[PDB]
Design a protein around this ligand. Structure first.
Ligand code: CLA
Ligand code: CLA
Ligand code: CLA
Ligand code: CLA
Ligand SMILES: C=Cc1c(C)c2cc3nc(c4c5[nH]c(cc6nc(cc1[nH]2)C(C)=C6CC)c(C)c5C(=O)[C@@H]4C(=O)OC)[C@@H](CCC(=O)OC/C=C(\C)CCC[C@H](C)CCC[C@H](C)CCCC(C)C)[C@@H]3C
Ligand SMILES: CC(C)=CCC/C(C)=C/CC/C(C)=C/CC/C(C)=C/CC/C(C)=C/CC/C(C)=C/CC/C(C)=C/CC/C(C)=C/CC/C(C)=C/CC1=CC(=O)C(C)=C(C)C1=O
Ligand SMILES: CCCCCCCCCCCCCCCCCC(=O)OC[C@H](CO[C@@H]1O[C@H](CO)[C@H](O)[C@H](O)[C@H]1O)OC(=O)CCCCCCCCCCCCCCCCC
Ligand SMILES: CCCCCCCCCCCCCCCCCC(=O)OC[C@H](CO[C@@H]1O[C@H](CO)[C@H](O)[C@H](O)[C@H]1O)OC(=O)CCCCCCCCCCCCCCCCC
Ligand SMILES: CCCCCCCCCCCCCCCC(=O)OC[C@H](COP(=O)(O)OC[C@@H](O)CO)OC(=O)CCCCCCCCCCCCCCC
Ligand SMILES: CC1=C(/C=C/C(C)=C/C=C/C(C)=C/C=C/C=C(C)/C=C/C=C(C)/C=C/C2=C(C)CCCC2(C)C)C(C)(C)CCC1
Ligand SMILES: CC1=C(/C=C/C(C)=C\C=C/C(C)=C/C=C/C=C(C)/C=C/C=C(C)/C=C/C2=C(C)CCCC2(C)C)C(C)(C)CCC1
Ligand SMILES: [Fe+2]
Ligand code: NA
Lengths: 187, 32, 76, 484, 348, 36, 27, 30, 31, 48, 30, 32, 30
């Protein structure tokens, strides 16, 4: 390799904890600690990054070819997230249970909506923003926080989805999850 | 597939009295 | 017999050790600071861990062409 | 008196009773060989040579008998599936009975040498005291060993007088005892070349005969005699033990890694064959060659032999059993009775998934089904409440293309998950677990048991050699220096 | 030798030079032990300082990358390299040193030189014991560390897929190896390992008890308050009261030593026997012949949803070690397992 | 012989070793390996 | 026949295959 | 039996150590 | 001198001082 | 603590080896070398 | 023919002989 | 029920060395 | 085994009678 001197009295080149990523008509600041992973749950996923510590803390974007011109044409944002109640993962258990505690009858998972927004960045196209607390009957990570930023630019729906366990969310991964959320800009 | 209970019975019935008699004969012949 | 007590007390030891020990320390310092440790022992620099093609942990996955492959996926 | 750990030292300066105790040990070993062979013949089931071979039945000395030529028994059967021709005197039971008769004769010789120990042959004519000319004894023994090595390599294994040795297919499909032509080139040092064994034994026998003649004719030097204590039997004990565990380490290594002297059809497959996908790669190559030229699926897979699919199965892995999982491999997970076929899995829209095979390190492994490209597409999840990978929502179907299941496609129930879990172990096989009341946990191969016993014995004999070399170099201080 | 003329050769002069009292004894064994041991320790200190592990393991294990003394290590080669001896001139490195460091060849260098250094050291013990005319019980005792080293760093990786599963020379590397044996082999459940643990704990107990007993039966032998200067090597009397020690331990423990011969032979015997049993156990683990399970317990718990033992808890813990450790432990296996198929308890 | 006191030499070597260990412990909080 | 397909055929089930570990420089 | 063998072995070991404590050979030479 | 004591002592001492200087240099290396 | 038990086994082996090795003749290849003198003498054996 | 691995191994044998000769020279000196 | 193989192995491993040691101790104590 | 045990017992009896015939104690007092 080429010979160059070591870094002495040369300061540090990265402290923000966020590295830019430019993709197919989208750009976002990924967490610097996180690393890429080739695990496509939904086939529409084009980019996926996950935490090296705990892979529940993960982020991915989907590039779904769509018909509706603008995100407002998907109706109310509630109507939009009702359509997207499939990328949360349906329960693989079908047995009867009234013993979960704090859940509906025969159910072992629940999702609570905590945010509904129509944020804008630079052009005028609106961004549907959502926060969802997903509580599973086992209580893993104390629940999972799903932050969704969705829009369509040309003819493809671009939906950010960062995941964070409630255990890590209370520790302080909220800053990085919200940083990815605000840095997802579709250009 | 081997009658090992009978094998154990035959082997023990051979080993224990033969060893007992051999030990008695050895201790008798050692001290005349 | 020089039982290691008289030599350490004598100044003849420290006259020739006021140059050799600091010179070795400075030699190690320059060996690190000039990148020669990276060049000799093949350790990557902090900016030379992930190439544009692969962004994950490298894998050798070959034996008889290991030299050629490690030259391929090293930091050029 | 003597300590219990010293009672065998009474025959150090008694060559006749040393010969007696060597004869006693030799009789015990030969009697064990005969009795072990008869036990394995009594518990052996020769009905299915393909799907229930000897290494699946816990047979230990039968592969070693087979490797050098005996194949048929007095019961009229042969391990190759052929019905027996005339076995002569040298069948399995005949060799066992010969070992038993030899054991009795050696017992009688041991008794004679115990009683008649004060033979003038063991007495030095020059001084009158008891002594052994150990360099000359070594020369005689090396000459005899070289003669035996040369005879075994030039007459037995080459087939000019003997039967030969076991030569098999590279994938262990067809194998038999055949004469072997020696390989005198560099290929003769190929461990898997069967020709390197006659060439080795011929050359080593010639060289051993030459070295035995040299030791018969030439006396050692005084410096080397005093340095190695050649007048002492404890020094040759240490050196012999050293050579013995060297050979034990060598046989354990060749046992574990496989060789031409370690046939797959006799000792089972290899853990490196499982890890490196030997049988799996050959099966896939055969299926691809049949599918690319003519024969379609479900009939190309029928061309796959039953033995090869049995080899491609982690239950035949020697590195899968346990230390106290005792007995035959059949007693572990049943006697194999048939090959259900190749479990092929498809998605709901249609693409072939593959169950990730279990490595040897894992007592248990997660059941995942991943794509041709290398991306996880389905699994049998633990949590069963998340993502898009559970079987019941991916919608994979298993088709099967083999013997009992040739066109039976299962898509809806948990039988798909069960077949995926069975497919992570390799080729799915039908097992009978009621004949031997089988356990369920995998057992070890005779190859693994041989390797474990010989490596443990090799380290124990390293300690024994170190102790004996200590004792023979330090004889003056182990006995006494008398205040000086 | 033996009342002979014995005209001198080069060997007599070489033996006379090598067998001399110096600052450090050399001997014939020093022709092997000194270079092999110096190269082993120097290679370990060099690999812990400069040689990376990014190529072979995909991790940082050196001081030039940000690792501590407890963290940096000389890492094993990649599993795809198998049991290759990894010579510099070999087909892998092909005479290229800076890639030989990157290919994990330093581990093979350090391991082979350490093995030959152990051989040379116990040869040196033999040579010094022969020079001073003493029995080589030190060599007999040192046979057990050599056995442990051989079975752990040679026999186990030769039984496994390759040198990759050998212990990397370090601290956190050894901790990884230990946790790997817990999760994959159930090494605590192995009776040979139990014998080794008993041997080491009993040897430490014997050392502490013998030292305390001798220091507490020291006799007067002087007038000062410091008993250490009360000792004289010239005198022919024992420095401590064996009768008093025997009576004390007979009335405290019930049994006591009456022979110094037997006491010190037991002190030699216990750790050597323990380490040899542990070496035999690691040899058993080299072929995955592990005492992992209890069949009766597992069948009982399979047919009974109520039956639980600490052994079943340990089995469940081993499953989690394997599942959550394999993906980042074995990069050759390419285990991209999703988080849902990995086992979890409740809420953690 | 006896020009510089042995206790003074050992004391100076002790301060140098303590200072080197202090640099080694300080480097665990800055630069590489500082987790930041 | 298809050495590229059979290499990818054995790619998902087992990553330790000889056919994969040899000539992996070209891939 | 399963637990009976374990109990027998444990009480045999305890009896051995009891005999070693109380019915030992009396110590001689120091 | 250059005896066995000198050779052994310096074969231990020289690379240790070189490596200690190297490590002290690596203490101030920042990413 | 790990270094302590490992070093305890090390030092126990070293002490046992040094005291079991440093002897003058008082026990022969038989049970004992009492031919010089039987039990009942204070003439000590051993070496340090 | 002579494979490069064989040529490198023969060069390694020569190098090992050189190292052994150097060690012998060093111990005949001093 | 009953693991008769384990029973036989445990019983033999107890009986044979204990009897051997007891016979040695008895013949040692008989002839001082 | 089945026939092996019978053969072992028969040859053991034959060896016992052979030893009784040949290696007996010499007949004392008449
Ligand atoms: C190194 C020689 C060797 C090897 C490699 C084998 C290998 C094998 N034998 Mg074999 N055997 C041998 C010598 C050997 N044997 C000898 C010398 C005898 C005469 C006693 C036998 C008699 C024999 C029989 C009767 C049988 C076998 C069987 C088997 C197969 C089943 C696995 C097994 O052994 O169970 C497990 C092995 C172990 C658990 C090893 C024990 C581990 C250590 C040494 C135990 C420690 C001892 C401990 C201190 C004692 C306390 C225990 C006490 C409480 C009971 C296997 C391939 C079986 C078979 O398949 O039928 C053909 C069968 O039934 N063998
Ligand atoms: C007339 C003599 C004779 C014959 C023809 C046989 C024949 C046989 N025996 Mg056998 N045996 C004999 C005597 C004999 N034995 C005696 C006297 C004993 C008591 C010690 C034994 C104990 C015995 C056992 C325990 C076993 C057999 C077994 C066998 C069968 C397979 C042998 C095999 O493949 O193993 C391979 C043989 C070897 C690997 C020997 C290799 C010799 C080493 C490599 C020598 C190396 C050191 C040498 C000194 C170096 C020389 C230097 C060189 C330059 C010349 C076979 C039918 C096996 C069997 O299946 O049971 C029936 C079995 O396990 N025998
Ligand atoms: C072919 C190899 C061999 C041979 C010929 C000998 C021969 C001898 N050894 Mg030795 N030894 C060996 C290997 C061998 N050893 C190994 C491998 C080890 C390491 C474990 C040792 C460790 C050793 C020690 C520590 C000592 C000897 C001693 C002795 C001498 C007599 C003591 C004696 O045996 O009394 C009788 C022995 C017993 C009654 C042992 C009881 C039976 C044991 C516990 C179980 C036997 C297992 C089973 C029945 C046999 C299967 C084993 C086989 C498959 C290998 C004698 C000349 C003693 C000595 O130096 O002389 C003063 C001594 O103290 N040996
Ligand atoms: C003198 C002590 C000594 C010893 C015992 C070793 C031992 C070892 N070294 Mg090492 N080495 C040493 C010194 C030593 N080294 C020195 C001083 C250096 C610095 C130059 C090295 C640098 C070094 C490197 C870089 C490597 C080793 C490696 C090895 C290992 C394998 C070597 C091998 O396979 O080739 C075998 C060597 C021989 C068989 C010796 C050849 C003897 C010849 C045939 C004698 C013939 C001459 C003949 C008498 C000429 C007259 C005949 C003529 C007139 C016709 C091995 C255990 C390798 C390793 O660590 O593995 C990973 C490796 O990579 N060494
Ligand atoms: C982790 C435990 C452990 C260590 C570190 C250790 C260390 C040592 N034991 C010695 C002796 C002994 N130890 C003994 C019994 C025991 N030793 C034990 C456990 C240990 N013993 C136990 C449990 C026993 C009881 C059986 C005896 C009986 C002796 C001695 O007589 C001997 C001595 O004289 O003590 C002063 C010393 C001389 C060895 C030498 O120079 O070899 C020369 C060879 C060398 C230096 C090359 C080997 C290099 C090694 C094997 C591979 C490379 C490793 C790197 C250099 C370092 C890696 C470090 C990381 C793993 C952290 C050495 C300090
Ligand atoms: C219902 C019941 C009973 C429940 C219990 C169930 C249960 C948990 C069972 C326990 C199972 C159990 C027994 C486990 C042990 C199994 C196991 C691991 C066995 C290891 C076997 C083995 C062969 C190991 C090989 C290694 C080996 C040889 C170890 C031996 C260890 C050992 C005996 C150490 C010595 C211990 C000891 C107390 C030393 C005595 C020290 C002492 C009193 C010195 C006295 C003394 C000191 C002096 O200095 C002087 C000067 C004099 C004069 C003097 O006198
Ligand atoms: C008497 C003392 C016996 C102690 C051993 C009992 C083992 C338990 C048992 O019953 O096994 C019994 C098992 C057989 O076990 C039975 O096998 C049957 C088929 O024949 C069925 O499969 C049964 O299910 C199965 O229980 O194996 C044995 O017979 C013991 C073989 C002994 C030799 C094994 C190889 C080990 C050799 C060397 C290793 C040691 C090296 C030195 C030390 C390190
Ligand atoms: C103990 C056994 C052996 C110790 C000597 C051999 C190892 C020496 C090299 C260590 C080294 O260089 O560290 C070098 C490291 C370097 O320090 C690292 O430097 C890096 C530079 O990129 C980074 O800055 C890291 O953040 C920084 O921690 O220093 C330390 O690890 C600090 C501790 C120093 C080592 C102490 C080891 C011994 C400690 C206690 C021994 C007590 C008792 C022993 C009893 C037996
Ligand atoms: C209230 C008192 C509390 C203590 C009571 C408990 C102490 C138990 C006594 C120790 C065991 C006796 C050892 C017999 C062996 C015996 O009596 O040998 C006798 C021996 C005495 O040896 P000598 O000095 O006489 O040796 C010279 C002889 O060769 C010549 O006679 O004792 C020792 O070796 C020293 C002590 C070792 C003791 C080792 C402890 C072993 C632990 C046992 C654990 C059992 C398993 C757990 C139970 C399931
Ligand atoms: C006299 C005579 C005879 C013969 C007889 C017989 C029949 C014999 C035999 C014999 C036999 C039939 C033998 C066998 C045997 C056996 C053995 C010898 C064994 C063993 C053992 C061991 C060695 C073990 C070990 C071990 C243990 C301890 C446990 C388990 C594991 C192990 C392995 C470790 C006749 C009449 C013919 C004729 C001539 C004369
Ligand atoms: C690699 C290699 C080699 C080898 C080399 C050598 C052999 C050398 C060396 C070296 C060395 C040898 C180095 C070193 C290092 C060291 C160090 C780095 C140290 C330290 C640190 C510390 C931290 C310390 C501390 C302390 C202690 C603990 C003790 C006392 C006190 C004090 C404080 C000082 C060669 C080239 C041949 C080639 C092949 C490979
Ligand atoms: Fe002492
Ligand atoms: Na839980």
């Amino acid at each position: 390799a080429y010979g160059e001197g070591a870094n002495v009295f040369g300061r540090v080149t990265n402290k923000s904890g966020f590295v830019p990523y430019a993709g197919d008509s989208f750009a976002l600041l990924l967490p610097s600690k996180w690393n890429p992973s080739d695990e496509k749950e939904v086939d529409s996923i084009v980019l996926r990054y996950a935490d090296n510590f705990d892979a529940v803390n993960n982020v991915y974007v989907i590039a779904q070819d769509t018909d509706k011109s603008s995100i407002q044409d998907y109706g109310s944002p509630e109507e939009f997230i009702s359509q997207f109640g499939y990328l949360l993962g349906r329960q693989a258990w079908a047995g009867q249970t009234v013993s979960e505690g704090g859940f509906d009858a025969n159910k072992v998972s629940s999702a609570a909506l905590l945010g509904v927004a129509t944020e804008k960045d630079k052009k005028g196209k609106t961004y549907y923003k959502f926060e969802i607390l997903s509580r599973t009957a086992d209580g893993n990570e104390g629940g999972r926080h799903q932050l969704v930023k969705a829009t369509v630019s040309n003819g493809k729906l671009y939906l950010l989805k960062v995941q964070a366990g409630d255990k890590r969310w209370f520790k302080g991964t909220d800053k990085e999850c919200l940083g990815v959320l605000d840095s997802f800009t579709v250009v | 597939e081997v009658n090992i209970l009978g094998l154990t019975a035959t082997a023990l019935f051979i080993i224990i009295p033969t060893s007992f008699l051999l030990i008695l004969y050895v201790k008798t012949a050692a001290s005349e | 017999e020089r039982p290691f007590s008289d030599i350490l007390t004598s100044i003849r030891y420290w006259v020739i050790h006021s140059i050799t020990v600091p010179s070795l320390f400075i030699a190690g310092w320059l060996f690190v600071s000039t990148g020669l440790a990276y060049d000799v022992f093949g350790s990557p620099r902090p900016n030379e861990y992930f190439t544009e093609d692969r962004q994950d942990a490298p894998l050798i996955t070959d034996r008889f062409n290991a030299l050629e492959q490690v030259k391929k996926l090293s930091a050029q | 008196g003597l300590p219990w750990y010293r009672v065998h030292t009474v025959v150090i300066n008694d060559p006749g009773r040393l010969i007696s105790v060597h004869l006693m040990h030799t009789a015990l070993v030969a009697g064990w060989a005969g009795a072990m062979t008869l036990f394995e013949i009594a518990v052996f089931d020769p009905s299915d040579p393909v799907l229930n071979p000897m290494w699946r039945q816990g047979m230990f000395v039968l592969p070693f008998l087979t490797r050098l030529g005996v194949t048929q028994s007095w019961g009229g059967w042969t391990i190759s599936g052929e019905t027996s021709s005339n076995p002569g005197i040298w069948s399995y039971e005949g060799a066992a009975a010969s070992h038993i008769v030899l054991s009795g004769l050696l017992f009688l010789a041991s008794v004679w040498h115990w009683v008649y120990w004060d033979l003038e042959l063991f007495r030095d004519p020059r001084t009158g005291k008891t002594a052994l000319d150990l360099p000359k004894i070594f020369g005689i023994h090396l000459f005899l060993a070289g003669l035996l090595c040369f005879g075994f390599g030039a007459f037995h294994v080459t087939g000019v007088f003997g039967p030969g040795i076991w030569v098999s297919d590279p994938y262990g499909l067809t194998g038999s005892v055949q004469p072997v032509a020696p390989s005198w080139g560099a290929e003769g040092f190929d461990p898997y070349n069967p020709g390197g064994v006659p060439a080795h034994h011929i050359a080593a026998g010639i060289l051993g005969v030459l070295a035995g003649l040299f030791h018969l004719c030439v006396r050692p030097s005084i410096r080397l005699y005093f340095g190695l204590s050649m007048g002492s039997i404890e020094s040759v004990l240490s050196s012999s033990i050293a050579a013995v565990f060297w050979a034990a380490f060598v046989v354990a290594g060749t046992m574990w890694y496989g060789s031409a002297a370690t046939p797959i059809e006799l000792f089972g497959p290899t853990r490196y064959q499982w890890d490196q996908g030997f049988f799996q790669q050959e099966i896939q190559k055969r299926v691809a060659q049949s599918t690319s030229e003519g024969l379609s699926v479900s009939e190309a897979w029928a061309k796959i032999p039953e033995k090869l699919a049995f080899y491609d199965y982690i239950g035949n892995n020697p590195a899968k059993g346990g230390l106290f999982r005792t007995g035959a491999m059949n007693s572990g997970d049943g006697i194999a009775v048939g090959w259900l076929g190749h479990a092929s899995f498809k998605d709901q829209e249609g693409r072939e998934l593959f169950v990730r095979r279990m490595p040897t390190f894992f007592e248990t492994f997660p059941v995942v089904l991943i794509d041709k490209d290398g991306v996880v597409r389905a699994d049998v999840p633990f949590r069963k409440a998340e993502s898009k990978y559970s079987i019941e929502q991916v919608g994979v179907s298993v088709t099967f293309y083999g013997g009992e299941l040739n066109g039976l496609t299962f898509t809806d129930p948990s039988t798909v998950k069960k077949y995926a879990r069975k497919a992570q172990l390799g080729e799915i096989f039908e097992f009978d677990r009621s004949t031997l009341q089988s356990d369920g946990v995998f057992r070890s191969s005779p190859r693994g048991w041989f390797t474990f016993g010989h490596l443990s014995f090799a380290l124990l004999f390293f300690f024994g050699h170190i102790w004996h070399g200590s004792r023979t170099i330090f004889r003056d201080v182990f006995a006494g220096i008398d205040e000086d | 030798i033996g009342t002979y003329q014995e005209k001198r050769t080069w060997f007599d002069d070489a033996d006379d030079w090598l067998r001399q009292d110096r600052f450090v004894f050399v001997g014939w064994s020093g022709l092997l032990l000194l270079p092999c041991a110096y190269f082993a320790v120097g290679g370990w200190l060099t690999g812990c300082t400069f040689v990376t592990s990014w190529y072979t393991h995909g991790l940082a294990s050196s001081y030039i990358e940000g690792c501590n003394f407890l963290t940096a290590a000389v890492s094993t080669p990649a599993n795809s390299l198998g049991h290759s001896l990894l010579f510099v001139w070999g087909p892998e490195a092909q005479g290229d040193l800076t890639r030989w460091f990157q290919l994990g060849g330093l581990w093979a260098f350090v391991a082979l030189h350490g093995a030959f250094g152990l051989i040379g050291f116990m040869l040196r013990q033999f040579e010094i014991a022969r020079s001073v005319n003493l029995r080589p019980y030190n060599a007999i005792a040192f046979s057990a560390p050599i056995a442990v080293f051989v079975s752990v760093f040679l026999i186990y990786p030769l039984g496994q897929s390759g040198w990759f599963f050998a212990p990397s020379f370090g601290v956190a590397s050894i901790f990884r190896f230990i946790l790997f044996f817990q999760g994959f082999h159930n090494w605590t459940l192995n009776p040979f390992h139990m014998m080794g643990v008993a041997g080491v704990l009993g040897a430490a107990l014997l050392c502490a008890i013998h030292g305390a007993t001798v220091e507490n039966t020291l006799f007067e032998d002087g007038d000062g308050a410091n008993t250490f200067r009360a000792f004289n090597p010239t005198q022919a009397e024992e420095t401590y009261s064996m009768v008093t020690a025997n009576r004390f331990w007979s009335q405290i423990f019930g049994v006591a030593f009456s022979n110094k011969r037997w006491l010190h032979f037991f002190m030699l015997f216990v750790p050597v026997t323990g380490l040899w049993m542990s070496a035999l156990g690691v040899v058993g683990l080299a072929l995955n012949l592990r005492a992992y399970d209890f069949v009766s317990q597992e069948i009982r718990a399979a047919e009974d949803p109520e039956f639980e033992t600490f052994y079943t808890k340990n089995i469940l813990l081993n499953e989690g070690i394997r599942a959550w450790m394999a993906a980042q432990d074995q990069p050759h296996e390419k285990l991209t397992l999703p988080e849902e198929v990995l086992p979890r308890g409740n809420a953690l | 012989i006896g020009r510089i006191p042995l206790w003074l030499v050992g004391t100076v070597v002790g301060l140098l070793a303590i200072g080197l260990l202090a640099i080694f412990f300080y480097g665990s909080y800055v630069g590489l390996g500082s987790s930041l | 026949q298809r050495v590229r397909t059979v290499l990818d055929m054995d790619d998902p089930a087992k990553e330790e295959t000889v056919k994969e570990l040899r000539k992996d420089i070209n891939n | 039996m399963e637990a009976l063998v374990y109990t027998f072995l444990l009480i045999g070991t305890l009896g051995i150590i009891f005999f070693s404590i109380f019915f030992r050979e009396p110590p001689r030479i120091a | 001198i250059f005896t066995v004591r000198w050779l052994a002592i310096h074969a231990i001492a020289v690379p240790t001082i070189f490596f200690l200087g190297a490590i002290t240099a690596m203490q101030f290396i920042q990413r | 603590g790990v270094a302590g038990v490992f070093g305890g086994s090390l030092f126990s082996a070293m002490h046992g080896s040094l005291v079991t090795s440093s002897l003058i003749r008082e026990t022969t290849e038989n049970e004992s070398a009492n031919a010089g003198y039987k039990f009942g003498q204070e003439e000590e054996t051993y070496n340090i | 023919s002579v494979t490069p691995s064989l040529k490198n191994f023969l060069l390694s044998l020569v190098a090992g002989a050189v190292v052994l000769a150097a060690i012998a020279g060093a111990v005949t000196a001093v």
